[PDB]
Homo-oligomer: A and B are copies of this chain.
Amino acid sequence: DLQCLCVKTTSQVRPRHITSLEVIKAGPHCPTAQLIATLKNGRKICLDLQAPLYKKIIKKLLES
């Protein structure tokens, strides 16, 4: 059995401090895609898939 990781979702994130972004396909464990984002100082946080905000973030991660 086993569950969704992302349910508590934040939008008080500085895109100028995200190191990874992981996009996981919705499936069996969770009926929605989950956007996990590793902040630079260690910690992770789930991102709002209803928020505009993951637009901004992927541009400045692919800009290199």
Contact = CB atoms under 8 A, between A and B. Distances in A.
Interface of A: 1-10, 12-13, 18-34, 36, 38, 40-46, 49-50, 54, 58, 60-64
Q: How many copies does the complex hold?
A: 4
A64 B19 contact: no
A54 to B, nearest CB: 7
A21 B61 CA distance: 13
Given A1-B7, A24-B61, A29-B43, 5 more contacts: A3-B8, A5-B29, A20-B22, A24-B42, A26-B63
Given A19-B27, A19-B41, A24-B20, A3 B46 contact: yes
Contact of A21 (B2, B22, B30, B50): B22
